[PDB]
């Protein structure tokens, strides 16, 4: 299983 998180961690996820 791979890591996931809240969108603010990556620029593509939150921005």
């Amino acid at each position, epitope marked *: *299983d*791979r*890591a*996931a*998180g*809240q*969108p*603010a*961690g*990556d*620029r593509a*996820d*939150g*921005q």
Partner: antibody
Amino acid sequence: QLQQSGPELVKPGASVKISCKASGYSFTGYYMHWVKQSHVKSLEWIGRIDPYDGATSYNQNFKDKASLTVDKSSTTGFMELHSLTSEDSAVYYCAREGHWDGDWYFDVWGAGTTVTVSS
Amino acid sequence: DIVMTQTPLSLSVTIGQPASISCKSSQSLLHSNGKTYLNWLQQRPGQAPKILMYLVSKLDPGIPDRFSGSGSETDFTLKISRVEAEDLGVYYCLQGTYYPFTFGSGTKLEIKR
């Protein structure tokens, strides 16, 4: 669950590398974030790292200042701070973004590493 | 970056009395996937921050039930029904909607005895 390295005294313009030893969980399954505590009540998010492939995501403020690496064999995460100034004297934390009921949040924190930049 | 404004910044509460902390964000924390990534954290003296609640109103299972969370898109509120002596510390709000993560200024909760 997370054990951080001891305090550091760093000369200005030098570099420091602090560690965050993980244990008791699948190391490659969770992001490892780093937080800076400059003043008494100031918290800044530095960045995160995927310990499986080393993929890193940085805060724009700490780009060219922080470098995140992991050692999968020792299940330890590292943050290197470059060209330290007095502004870098702070307490740095590592945290795990854990999983509970399909949701993700900072469920484990290290005790913090005190970094003092001085001549 | 999202600006997180906490009111008040200091708070004095007697043991057994309610306490309320507000957090206002510069933009709506409702993500496109429908989740509102607002987190409340507590930092006791000499300790690392600890998550009290995530997703506005969901408590971490270890946290006692006297803590509760509410609030919409931009305005949020952390409530303690009955303040106890162990609740002393600094309280933060944390948004996880927009990159990058941004914390609030922090609210210092002091006990009156």
